[PDB]
Amino acid sequence: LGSDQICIGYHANNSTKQVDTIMEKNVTVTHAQDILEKTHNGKLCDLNGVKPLILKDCSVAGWLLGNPMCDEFIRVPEWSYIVERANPANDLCYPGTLNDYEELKHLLSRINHFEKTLIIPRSSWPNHETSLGVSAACPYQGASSFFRNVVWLIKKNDAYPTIKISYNNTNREDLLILWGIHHSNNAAEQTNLYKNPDTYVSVGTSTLNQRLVPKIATRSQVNGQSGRMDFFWTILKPNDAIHFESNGNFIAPEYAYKIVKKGDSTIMKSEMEYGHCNTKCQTPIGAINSSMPFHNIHPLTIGECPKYVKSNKLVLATGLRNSP
Amino acid sequence: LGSDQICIGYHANNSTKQVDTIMEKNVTVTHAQDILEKTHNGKLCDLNGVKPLILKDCSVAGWLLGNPMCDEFIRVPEWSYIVERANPANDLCYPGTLNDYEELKHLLSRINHFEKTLIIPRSSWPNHETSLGVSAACPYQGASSFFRNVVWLIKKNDAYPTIKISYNNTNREDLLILWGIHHSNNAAEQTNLYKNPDTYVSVGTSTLNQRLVPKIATRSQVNGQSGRMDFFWTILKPNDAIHFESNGNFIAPEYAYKIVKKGDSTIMKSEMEYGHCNTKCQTPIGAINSSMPFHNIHPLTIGECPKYVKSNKLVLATGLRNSP
Amino acid sequence: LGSDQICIGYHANNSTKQVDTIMEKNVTVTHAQDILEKTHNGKLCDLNGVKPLILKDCSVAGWLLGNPMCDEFIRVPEWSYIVERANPANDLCYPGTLNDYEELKHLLSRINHFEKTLIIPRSSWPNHETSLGVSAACPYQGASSFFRNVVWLIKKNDAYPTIKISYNNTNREDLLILWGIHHSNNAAEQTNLYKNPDTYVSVGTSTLNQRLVPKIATRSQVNGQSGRMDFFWTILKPNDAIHFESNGNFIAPEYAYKIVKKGDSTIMKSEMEYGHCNTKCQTPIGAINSSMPFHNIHPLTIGECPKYVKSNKLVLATGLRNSP
Amino acid sequence: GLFGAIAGFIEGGWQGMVDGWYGYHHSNEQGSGYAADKESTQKAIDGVTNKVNSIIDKMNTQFEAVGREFNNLERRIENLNKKMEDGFLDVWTYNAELLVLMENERTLDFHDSNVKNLYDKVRLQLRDNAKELGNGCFEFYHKCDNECMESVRNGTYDYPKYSEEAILKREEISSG
Amino acid sequence: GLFGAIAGFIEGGWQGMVDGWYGYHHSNEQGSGYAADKESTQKAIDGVTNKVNSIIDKMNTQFEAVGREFNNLERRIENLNKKMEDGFLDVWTYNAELLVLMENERTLDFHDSNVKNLYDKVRLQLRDNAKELGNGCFEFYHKCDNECMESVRNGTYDYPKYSEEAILKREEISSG
Amino acid sequence: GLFGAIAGFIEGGWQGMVDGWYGYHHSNEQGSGYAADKESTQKAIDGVTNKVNSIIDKMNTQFEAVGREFNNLERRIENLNKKMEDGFLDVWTYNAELLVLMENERTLDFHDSNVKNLYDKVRLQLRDNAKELGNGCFEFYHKCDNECMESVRNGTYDYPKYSEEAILKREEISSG
Ligand SMILES: *[C@@H]1O[C@H](CO)[C@@H](O[C@@H]2O[C@H](CO)[C@@H](O[C@@H]3O[C@H](CO)[C@@H](O)[C@H](O)[C@@H]3O)[C@H](O)[C@H]2NC(C)=O)[C@H](O)[C@H]1NC(C)=O
Ligand SMILES: *[C@@H]1O[C@H](CO)[C@@H](O[C@@H]2O[C@H](CO)[C@@H](O[C@@H]3O[C@H](CO)[C@@H](O)[C@H](O)[C@@H]3O)[C@H](O)[C@H]2NC(C)=O)[C@H](O)[C@H]1NC(C)=O
Ligand SMILES: *[C@@H]1O[C@H](CO)[C@@H](O[C@@H]2O[C@H](CO)[C@@H](O[C@@H]3O[C@H](CO)[C@@H](O)[C@H](O)[C@@H]3O)[C@H](O)[C@H]2NC(C)=O)[C@H](O)[C@H]1NC(C)=O
Ligand SMILES: *[C@@H]1O[C@H](CO)[C@@H](O[C@@H]2O[C@H](CO)[C@@H](O)[C@H](O)[C@H]2NC(C)=O)[C@H](O)[C@H]1NC(C)=O
Ligand SMILES: *[C@@H]1O[C@H](CO)[C@@H](O[C@@H]2O[C@H](CO)[C@@H](O)[C@H](O)[C@H]2NC(C)=O)[C@H](O)[C@H]1NC(C)=O
Ligand SMILES: *[C@@H]1O[C@H](CO)[C@@H](O[C@@H]2O[C@H](CO)[C@@H](O)[C@H](O)[C@H]2NC(C)=O)[C@H](O)[C@H]1NC(C)=O
Ligand SMILES: *[C@@H]1O[C@H](CO)[C@@H](O)[C@H](O)[C@H]1NC(C)=O
Ligand SMILES: *[C@@H]1O[C@H](CO)[C@@H](O)[C@H](O)[C@H]1NC(C)=O
Numbered sequence A, B, C: 001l002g003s004d005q006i007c008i009g010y011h012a013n014n015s016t017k018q019v020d021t022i023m024e025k026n027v028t029v030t031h032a033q034d035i036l037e038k039t040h041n042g043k044l045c046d047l048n049g050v051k052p053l054i055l056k057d058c059s060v061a062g063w064l065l066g067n068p069m070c071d072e073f074i075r076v077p078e079w080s081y082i083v084e085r086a087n088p089a090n091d092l093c094y095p096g097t098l099n100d101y102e103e104l105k106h107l108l109s110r111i112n113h114f115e116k117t118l119i120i121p122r123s124s125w126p127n128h129e130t131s132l133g134v135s136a137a138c139p140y141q142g143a144s145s146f147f148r149n150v151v152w153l154i155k156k157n158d159a160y161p162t163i164k165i166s167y168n169n170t171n172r173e174d175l176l177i178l179w180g181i182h183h184s185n186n187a188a189e190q191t192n193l194y195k196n197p198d199t200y201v202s203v204g205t206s207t208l209n210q211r212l213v214p215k216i217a218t219r220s221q222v223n224g225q226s227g228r229m230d231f232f233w234t235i236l237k238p239n240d241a242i243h244f245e246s247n248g249n250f251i252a253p254e255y256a257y258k259i260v261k262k263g264d265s266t267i268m269k270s271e272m273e274y275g276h277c278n279t280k281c282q283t284p285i286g287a288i289n290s291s292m293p294f295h296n297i298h299p300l301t302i303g304e305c306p307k308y309v310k311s312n313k314l315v316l317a318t319g320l321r322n323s324p
Numbered sequence D, E, F: 001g002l003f004g005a006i007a008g009f010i011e012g013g014w015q016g017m018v019d020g021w022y023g024y025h026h027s028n029e030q031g032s033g034y035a036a037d038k039e040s041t042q043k044a045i046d047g048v049t050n051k052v053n054s055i056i057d058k059m060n061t062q063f064e065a066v067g068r069e070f071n072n073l074e075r076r077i078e079n080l081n082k083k084m085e086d087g088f089l090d091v092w093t094y095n096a097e098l099l100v101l102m103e104n105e106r107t108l109d110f111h112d113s114n115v116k117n118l119y120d121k122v123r124l125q126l127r128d129n130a131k132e133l134g135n136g137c138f139e140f141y142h143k144c145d146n147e148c149m150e151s152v153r154n155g156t157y158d159y160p161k162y163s164e165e166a167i168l169k170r171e172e173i174s175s176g
């Protein structure tokens, strides 16, 4: 009816999405975009197509030394990370110690090939007693036994002749070897078990030069045992040899492990179980799949992850101010 | 006389405050605002309502072992952080060593409850001599004495019978225990003090398994003493027991400390004294009270602080350009 | 022909330089400016006018102990950083060990003054044999010899009388001292070399209190030697004295080094050679001279450097959009 | 900040314009309707999604990772890791929050400028041929049909054509 | 950057305007005086203090702390801590210096846009009823009393009212 | 973002203007030519190089440095250093990439505003003495020689002088 018109304007829609701005808060807008990743799948997954090593009720130590309840094993022989329960129930059945445990675990966190092999058989201790090295602390089928991958040698007849043995690694691969020494409780036990009262365990490679001596003393019971067993380890390079010598208290290797390492990783503490998935970024409460630059799920990631922040939203405006 | 007018304009004032800008420097402006915190109160304060433990002329070690000049003590029994002088004069009166000292100090930096208790009394060494374990290195009222919380046992008659004692922690609380061993200087001193020439000190808990042996050798005098005393410590969990055995050179616990830890902190080096204030953020040269996001006072903060920078000003413009 | 005109405009040129913008890519522009430093001179240089210590085919250890192929030395006596080859060929000729090696290297990375001095001469071992402490592992002029700065003492006549010697540092300067102990292979070698079968090495200062005992055991050959030599070090403060005692297996100091430290640095691994230049910022593949705030040459810098990034360009626009 | 007007001299937005982000609403005797500035909208859609993608793509250093491996007598070293971990979290947290805030301010006034640049394209084409109502509209002095309406929408309006019919309607409005 | 004019087409600010940040100076036969745009000044006071508060409040991760605990044979680890401590200081130092610089540039041209948007609010209300002197003032063709002066200060000026009186004063200035 | 026009109402730049960054092209009967706004170009050269210098100079904490010193049984500690090293590289890398992007956006629209502020300086000097062609040019209604041309280039153009000569040419273009 009146004069003709043309207006300039801009669109608007039903969006309730809000955004903030250095100068203004809670500004409604056409379209927006959260760049903060907030979701995970609730699962333990492979890491770039490699399954992790999930010890169930075992510690790395229990697993390696072959605690009788960990040899529910058969595996692996390759993994991207390790996952332990917070308090795995089967650690060192016979109480004691594994030297440089933490560094060992780190070394073992991501392994490219791993294989148990018989290194010195139980039938190469003709003058010592192999089958009596057993304990109620460390039981299997109701019968009491011991770490399966190592041998608690005791005296035969009334003698413990001095052991001088050596093993040459003739494999392509580095190999990881564990032995130990037993700390007895008093003069009687040490004689009863080993005859000789003043004993040692010495170990040499091209690198290693150790000599261990049992501390005979009184300690409080752990798993009903005041005795104590300290273990040690080394990586015997190909074509090197390890040299053992002992006149008592020796906990001798039977099996050892072939290892090849090329890559680092770490140990995850989580109560979950394998979820038959795959991810680039794993957390203890679940895996994250995104290209978003930040996340807020969990700080202990392993993988290639967005950057962890204390934030609930990172909302970027793409549209315009939206009026009523 | 002429036509009517109306101008649009903006204000200005006598402000000399200057600001910088990516494209321009030294630009005068109406109002501004430094966001860089630059002041502190010059005082050592409580940290969220908890007094720190200010050792005056004592080291943590002197304090714990009860160096005769540190037992001018009466305290505490709770603290948020510890402050030491740079070179506290009363450390180890009798020269030596405290094992894992640095880790121990860290453990003790913030403590929720701390209480000295008599753990084994001097009247439970009937066959040894308690009151002769004393030294000119380590004097009190001009008379020479020794660390008050531990006992330098020596031979009685011409004998040092072998000690086998144990103590069971029957308290609710973890407790921190210290003992030591004495390194004598030659065969004569060792016989003179302990009779037996070849001696040891062994110590066991459910966790600990140590055996110490004195190094009898020649060392340069410190506080006029070539002898040396090495101390050690453990945290005995409730219901565990510690087991001591020694035929010589034993520096035995008398007192121990109940501890409950829930929180971490650290050790501040500062020459100041308690200022009867409270703060959220403490530095060695004074406490800072602000909500400003950056500061430049001092890098060794303890508390919840702004972020340290190398800067003298962070001035934000709020007003407009101010003209002549 | 038509009316007069005046246009407002802006310039343009034949620049092809491109720039990016949060909202636009590959935008051509008049002038631009890379703020990412991408070049280095390909040389190992002095660091603020101080030449680095470039061990050629020697390790720090070989160099300090005076391995017969490292005493191609004459130097230094000041340096800003050290550069080692990745695998220097002359380390420990006689196989073994240098304790706290890594910390020692760190201490020595930047040294303000360094000077070898005769501390105890070979002609002060009248009752022991100095010139027979020699090995094929460790040859010089085709003749077999030994670390030059230390002395492998062996028995004289059929005796190794107990050594009690001491040295007082009477210099202005701290001094760095090294000694060692020899681990023999069996009862025969030990008797053949030292007579006494049960030996020790004890060492004391005001600070140090050590006692070393040889492990007599079987080890695999390295440089054709199953024997093993462990070395140790200390910094003897001015006016303090070091006290040695041993009845066998002692590798005794002859020379020691005066040191003054005031500044920290580190160890560079590089295969390059001195380029007779000077820089503020050195990398293992060359030195960088710039005031640019970022670089991408190499992460292992030593000096005052720009900040390392994963980036190929950081191009800032200075000009305007350049049209066709 | 604000260029002339989004929520300024242009009170609100066309709920009914659905073919773009910025455009024009006309009315004449032939009818009325919305029509988006296709070309102008595409510029902004590109700029904006380019902004978001840059913020994502430049992170392009994610790397590799871990948790918690020191023991009960390595508390000092663990505390060092804590400090580092916390320190980075504080840095990334602040940078992201401010990035978002700052970049939203700039996204909104980007839209503002785009619109104001359109008002101005039109304003400089008509002039005394129409009244600047000042609410973002123009009241034509002459009569402007749909073929004419499109000629301003595409920057080809013919001033010399109607500058006459207009002069005439100004001499009508300055009288009864 | 610069919008039209703070130190542009408006050399200088009203030393005498003391009730706000942006406003108007008039002169007519009743007198002359300054009067701030209350509403427009409050917008800016809000935006600016909102900026400052955001810069402060988003840090909202302060955390917890320490000094210096490694010993004489742990120099390597201490150096690690040095590098970390220095590294954060370098990062926070740079981010803060540039934040301040960049955000000051933008605070100043914010004020610029606020003023220019005011010139434009007034300009689009009067038109041929006043001359754009171009120094930031308007010379009225008609006579504008204080009740009139306030009617432009609050966006309710009545164009259709005074057109009458103005066209007449243009035909006076183009003659004797 | 875009102020009126760089690649807006002024398609393209003067390949032939070589004495500055912004300026004027004239044509009259005496001839035609380019001439840069010396004063306006220097402002921008100063602002821009000040920006670059600030980005450099504020880093002003470079500090001091190292490589790789932990051994085969100190892998945990080395991994701590790795994380730290990588962490700082991720932070600096992102902050630099975005700084560049953001600051380039702003450098370009700085130039845009500078130009538009020049159009406006000239526009507010002439008025009804010239036609706003809307492509960035002004068609003089009167005749403007080189002495006149320079008088606008330096902000001393004499409006009261050429009125009428213009009013006269408007009454010629509105007739046949
Ligand atoms: C573990 O066993 C292997 C093999 O039995 C040892 O390596 C072998 O070392 C010999 C010499 O020590 C190598 O020599 C080769 O033959 C003759 C020997 O007279 C020599 O003259 C030649 O020049 C040639 O190199 C031999 O290649 C090598 N064998 C293999 C299969 O690698 C190794 O030393 C043993 N480890 C220890 C600690 O004994
Ligand atoms: C340190 O403290 C106590 C000594 O009182 C020891 O724990 C206590 O052990 C007794 C038996 O050894 C527990 O006895 C309880 O009642 C009967 C009576 O002997 C017994 O047959 C039951 O088996 C039952 O457990 C008693 O519960 C327990 N006390 C507490 C408060 O837990 C403890 O073993 C000593 N620690 C060490 C390391 O020696
Ligand atoms: C290592 O050697 C130095 C001397 O070469 C020792 O320091 C010196 O100690 C002597 C006394 O032992 C000081 O004697 C001075 O002379 C007069 C003479 O009667 C005396 O009355 C003064 O009171 C004064 O003490 C001498 O000044 C001092 N000199 C220096 C440079 O220290 C040092 O104690 C020796 N350290 C060891 C561990 O043997
Ligand atoms: C811009 O607008 C004009 C408005 O008329 C368009 O002109 C019409 O274009 C169509 C399709 O080519 C013709 O069939 C009509 O007859 C035209 N009408 C008139 C009056 O010219 C023009 O096409 C538009 N230009 C562009 C490039 O899209
Ligand atoms: C907005 O401006 C107008 C004009 O100055 C004001 O209108 C006057 O209001 C008073 C008070 O109610 C009346 O008595 C006058 O007659 C009005 N004057 C005119 C010229 O119409 C109005 O008050 C202003 N509003 C505010 C809130 O200040
Ligand atoms: C701005 O331009 C004008 C010309 O438009 C310059 O005026 C000339 O100045 C001198 C005085 O020394 C006279 O002799 C010339 O005749 C003037 N020209 C005209 C047309 O009158 C003026 O110098 C310039 N201003 C500045 C500050 O550079
Ligand atoms: C992760 O999500 C992306 C798209 O965001 C998808 O392409 C991909 O299939 C998902 N990954 C897995 C393992 O399913
Ligand atoms: C800190 O200073 C503020 C003012 O800046 C003051 O209000 C407050 O009371 C002070 N805090 C304490 C704990 O004394």
Ligand SMILES: *[C@@H]1O[C@H](CO)[C@@H](O)[C@H](O)[C@H]1NC(C)=O
Binding pocket: C278, C279, C280, C289, C290
């Ligand atoms: C850095 O480069 C400049 C040349 O632009 C030169 O003057 C200076 O000497 C260089 N510095 C070094 C240490 O080579």
